[PDB]
Amino acid sequence: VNSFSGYLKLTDNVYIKNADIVEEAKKVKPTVVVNAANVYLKHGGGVAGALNKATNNAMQVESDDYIATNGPLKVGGSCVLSGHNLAKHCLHVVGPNVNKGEDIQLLKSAYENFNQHEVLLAPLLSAGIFGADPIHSLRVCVDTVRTNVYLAVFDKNLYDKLVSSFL
Ligand SMILES: CC(=O)Nc1ncc(S(=O)(=O)NC(=O)C2(c3ccc(Cl)c(Cl)c3)CCC2)s1
């Protein structure tokens, strides 16, 4: 039993809610919240901009130190950093950005990072300003993630389309 409430069950291990990931993280304080990161951990917009804003830019400060020490992530890769006021940990995961011309096949590799964590609050990878088809992202999620994932979708219109098209 966990504290995630108001989720539709899609499969044995995948759940989906119409919720702002920022507010869901603040409410639940999950062990892991996933960020829709880029390789430079520059949290300017989309999910990342919103999560970082909610940390009062502390996520960005921590991220800049991480990059100065370690260099950029790989597309499809991830790192674990602090969750600040939102979660114990933040798993920064880099899905491919279609608007940069990046390989959509890397989406499966990106979701594989979730399997290193027993339970996660997450957005759909490569959705929104990353330019992928969110229905495809949900399919890859369900077919790749084996741990317990709670997906938060802000847009009600999108959420209903995701539910109504799910096989
Ligand atoms: C604060 C914040 O951004 N919180 C998020 N939680 C979850 C998400 S998301 O990754 O599911 N993206 C979305 O819902 C979209 C969206 C459409 C319209 C608006 Cl107004 C917003 Cl904010 C987001 C982008 C693709 C639909 S963004």
UniProtKB/Swiss-Prot annotation:
Activity-regulation annotation: Inhibited in vitro by GRL-0617.
Localization: Host endoplasmic reticulum membrane
Catalytic activity, as annotated: Thiol-dependent hydrolysis of ester, thioester, amide, peptide and isopeptide bonds formed by the C-terminal Gly of ubiquitin (a 76-residue protein attached to proteins as an intracellular targeting signal)
Coiled coil (UniProt feature): none
Membrane topology of the entry: Multi-pass membrane protein
Domain named Macro: residues: 1-167
Subunit relationships: May form homohexamers. Interacts with N protein.
Function: Responsible for the cleavages located at the N-terminus of the replicase polyprotein. Participates together with nsp4 in the assembly of virally-induced cytoplasmic double-membrane vesicles necessary for viral replication. Antagonizes innate immune induction of type I interferon by blocking the phosphorylation, dimerization and subsequent nuclear translocation of host IRF3. Also prevents host NF-kappa-B signaling. In addition, PL-PRO possesses a deubiquitinating/deISGylating activity and processes both 'Lys-48'- and 'Lys-63'-linked polyubiquitin chains from cellular substrates.
Name recorded for this polypeptide: Papain-like protease nsp3
Residues of the full protein shown: 1025 to 1191 of 7096
